[PDB]
């Protein structure tokens, strides 16, 4: 909004070396399209060769989820380190991730296909961590990734 | 318009080697006709022996259709690579080609005889392709071609 024009014009042959490069240091481009205006083209991070963290949206989603889980878990500090607190925190985390699955952010037809949360003695914690005041929770989450190139095949049909 | 005259006069015996030639490098002619003025005569490309791309109008039509399909499809970049986006893009393409059939540009008495559009897993795309971000659509179109020669035959009718 409130934009007249980019100062430089970038073509496809130039963006070929801006989006994919041996170093992984991707650069996103602002380009004008006819009848549309000035658009943001490219959504890749500075780690563009990383099989997990190529895309901006995946990392932003992971940051949001992690901070909200952190806020939800904070009220349990200074509690007795026993099975009851483990159960409480596990229930909180599963409820949050279920609400997130319902919104369409996680992949899968059922909650059991989207995430898992685990805590327990000799499962995630050794007694050493328990006695000294630590809790260990293991969380896994399934996400989806975007498509960037759309291709077409044109042909003639027998009359 | 605003033309007095061609600098050279071209006859039929000379255009015989300008319109059809073993190399395919056709040359179109500007000729004066009595009572009509100066007309453009010939509508063939530099690939005059190609069974598909002889005529200028066919290639210009294909270019127009391809660029408009491109513009229509651009808003779907960066979308999730799933069946819903495939459905969305397929519907857009069929609607455009239907509007073009209605105008008289495509051959056939019904839309099903003029074009076809296809997309799907193990139909146009493969599994691995999904993992990278690519969509493949197959489109076929039927067109018509002009007539160049008119032959008249005369005889004596019996009284």
């Amino acid at each position: 909004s409130s934009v007249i024009k980019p100062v430089l014009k970038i073509t496809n042959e130039q963006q070929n070396n801006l989006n994919v490069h041996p170093t992984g240091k991707s650069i996103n481009a602002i380009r004008a399209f006819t009848g549309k205006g000035t658009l943001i083209w490219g959504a890749r991070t500075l780690a563009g060769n990383d099989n997990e963290w190529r895309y901006v949206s995946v990392r932003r989603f992971f940051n949001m989820a992690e901070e909200s889980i952190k806020k939800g878990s904070e009220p349990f500090v200074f509690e007795p380190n026993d099975a009851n607190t483990w159960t409480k925190v596990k229930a909180m985390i599963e409820n949050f991730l279920t609400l997130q699955w319902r919104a369409g952010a996680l992949a899968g037809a059922k909650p059991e296909q989207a995430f898992y949360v685990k805590i327990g003695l000799n499962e995630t914690m050794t007694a050493l961590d328990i006695l000294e005041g630590r809790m260990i929770v293991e969380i896994g989450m399934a996400v989806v990734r975007p498509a960037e190139f759309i291709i077409l095949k044109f042909s003639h049909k027998m009359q | 318009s605003s033309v007095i005259k061609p600098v050279l006069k071209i006859t039929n015996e000379q255009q015989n080697n300008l319109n059809v030639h073993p190399t395919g490098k056709s040359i179109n002619a500007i000729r004066a006709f009595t009572g009509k003025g100066t007309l453009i005569w010939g509508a063939r490309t530099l690939a005059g022996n190609d069974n598909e791309w002889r005529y200028v109008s066919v290639r210009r039509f294909f270019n127009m259709a391809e660029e408009s399909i491109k513009k229509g499809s651009e808003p779907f970049v960066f979308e999730p690579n799933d069946a819903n986006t495939w459905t969305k893009v397929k519907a857009m393409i069929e609607n455009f080609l239907t509007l073009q059939w209605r105008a008289g540009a495509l051959a056939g008495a019904k839309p099903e005889q003029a074009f076809y559009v296809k997309i799907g897993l193990n139909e146009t795309m493969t599994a691995l392709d999904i993992l990278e971000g690519r969509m493949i659509v197959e489109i076929g179109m039927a067109v018509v071609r002009p007539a160049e020669f008119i032959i008249l035959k005369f005889s004596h009718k019996m009284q």
């Binding site: - | 008289g104 056939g108 008495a109 019904k110 005889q113």
Partner: protein, 153 residues
Amino acid sequence: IRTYPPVSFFFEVVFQGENLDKDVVETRFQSVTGLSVDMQTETLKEGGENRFEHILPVRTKYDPLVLKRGLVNDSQMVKWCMDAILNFDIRPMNLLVRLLHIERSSSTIAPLMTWKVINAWPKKWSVSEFNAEQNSIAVESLELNYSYFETLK
């Protein structure tokens, strides 16, 4: 032997004229009518024959041709008509009227019936009323004179 009659709403008009046969907007009409012929006669009575009289042929008359469209703001045809009407300069033309159908042997659009209309020139031109309180389309109507029409057998 026929079992079902043809349909009237699929039709076309072609102007075999100055260069109007290649202009797409010059073939699209909302309505076409006026294709009818009439024989005019006189009556003669013979004395002594009281059972009937004699009807004798005299001449032949044709109806004007009427076309209706939505208003086209720049038309070569209307330039031709207004040149005839304002500057008293007429140049008659030939026309074709076609009734179309679907033929298949896949399918194709083909003419079913064709009439040739000979020596047409402008007769009347009109546009519909403008009214601030109605939902309507600006519709223009043209009427033409001609000599006769024939079937393209």
